[PDB]
């Protein structure tokens, strides 16, 4: 009793945004690529090899958005031949795997750094930062290939308008065709989102349970109380935190009570950026990754007629917001990265 047809068009709302984002994006990652390379030194911060890589994939993406800005503008008309439609598409997914793979190497930096599972000679942090960055780019390009090979152009539906689209006609037969849509889709998001995002959640966890316990400096005599070491000479064993130390405890060095101590909140900015990145990363990339995952569950749990169409005319949006998640890391480094903000003022002056 049920039929399938689009929602009231958004006009040029998306292609507008697409250009806005190409505009801010090409100019915003343009910087964090100079700011990291304006520095020539071995004063490159650990988590900088990944911020560069983050900028490059966000960049190679947003440069193509003039292409996707017209195609969505002429209501799906691709006048750029099969090559670009292949290649341009191929770079949507390249960026998406890279952006994920960076944001966890960005995080696996802070786990290696801020928990140090092995001793510091064997921690090999630059290499683990740098071997990470190489095999990163090789995955995100390799596993992005079925979108290079299979995406073709073609006027579906008899309408005098070309469409760029995934064509399972090499790989599939007409009944198994939806299978390759589903498998190549649950691959993408799985490797693309659920594996990375839980990794970053896994990393983000172990960081807090060691970040958990707090050092404490004696405000009068200077002695610092680390909960790993403790003060076992005075009864209070290691691994204990400060508020549990019996309230009769006093400074081992001078003997003022707990009344005069001072928790150090060791100002880290590397970690605080890496989450604001991730928590907006996983806020823009969740929609597109929730719906594509419901709709390929939606052919294979048999969702009502209502739903499948819903999730189809929902999608061009979720694409478009997850697409902006590129031209935001440039803004986030501004509102939050010290090394970044400073490296800007500096060039400014000179001219």
């Amino acid at each position: 009793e049920c039929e399938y047809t689009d929602w009231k068009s958004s006009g040029a709302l998306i292609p507008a945004i697409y250009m806005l984002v190409f505009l801010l994006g090409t100019t915003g990652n343009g910087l964090v690529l100079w700011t990291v390379f304006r520095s020539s030194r071995e004063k490159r911060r650990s988590a900088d090899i990944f911020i560069a890589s983050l900028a490059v994939a966000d960049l190679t993406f947003v440069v193509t958005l003039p292409l996707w800005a017209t195609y969505t503008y002429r209501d799906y008309d691709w006048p750029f031949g099969t090559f670009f439609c292949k290649l341009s598409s191929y770079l949507i997914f390249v960026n998406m795997y890279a952006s994920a793979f960076c944001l966890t190497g960005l995080s696996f930096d802070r786990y290696l750094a801020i928990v140090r599972p092995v001793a510091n000679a064997r921690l090999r942090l630059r290499v683990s930062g740098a071997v990470a960055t190489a095999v990163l780019w090789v995955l995100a390009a390799l596993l992005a290939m079925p979108v290079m090979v299979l995406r073709t152009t073609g006027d579906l539906e008899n309408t005098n308008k070309v469409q760029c689209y995934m064509d399972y006609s090499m790989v599939a037969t007409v009944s198994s065709e939806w299978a390759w849509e589903v498998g190549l889709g649950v691959s993408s998001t799985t490797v693309g989102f659920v594996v990375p995002f839980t990794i970053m959640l896994t990393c983000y966890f172990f960081i807090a349970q060691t970040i958990a316990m707090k050092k404490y400096t004696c405000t009068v005599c200077g002695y610092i109380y680390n909960p790993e070491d403790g003060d076992p000479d005075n009864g209070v064993n290691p691994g204990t935190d400060f508020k549990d130390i019996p309230d009769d405890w006093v400074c081992p060095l001078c003997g003022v009570g707990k009344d005069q101590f001072e928790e150090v909140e060791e100002r880290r900015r590397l970690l605080s950026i890496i989450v604001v990145l991730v928590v907006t990363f996983a806020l823009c990339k969740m929609p597109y990754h929730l719906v594509k995952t419901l709709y390929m569950l939606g052919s294979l749990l048999h969702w009502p007629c209502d739903f499948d169409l819903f999730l189809m005319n929902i999608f061009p949006y979720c694409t478009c917001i997850s697409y902006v998640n590129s031209c935001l890391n440039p803004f986030l480094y501004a509102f939050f990265d010290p090394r970044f903000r400073q490296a800007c003022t500096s060039m400014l002056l000179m001219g």
Partner: nanobody
Amino acid sequence: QVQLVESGGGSVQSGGSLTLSCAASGSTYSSHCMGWFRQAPGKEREGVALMTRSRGTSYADSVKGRFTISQDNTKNILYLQMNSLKPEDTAMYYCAAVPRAGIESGAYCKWNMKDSGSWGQGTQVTVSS
């Protein structure tokens, strides 16, 4: 793994009310679209009433306003309600079906690509004077 069986069409006289089921199997609304053709014969094959991505249904200029078409994912069946029938609509009707595309394309029915998709025997309709 996909079958389509046309049932409903015999002989009716002008101005009649026919309705033609295309009971479908293996197909999914989610992955597949549905449409109707016909042959005279002595002529060619011609699209009648399809189920499109963009417009609700793309009728042909001749059958427009007379035929009504509907899907029913519940029992998975495509319909063709023919009202006020013309003898030039004397012909044998088949239902096809076609795969759509990853929503990255727009869930677009591949109507044109090849119409070497899921077909059926056709059912034949006869309109006399």
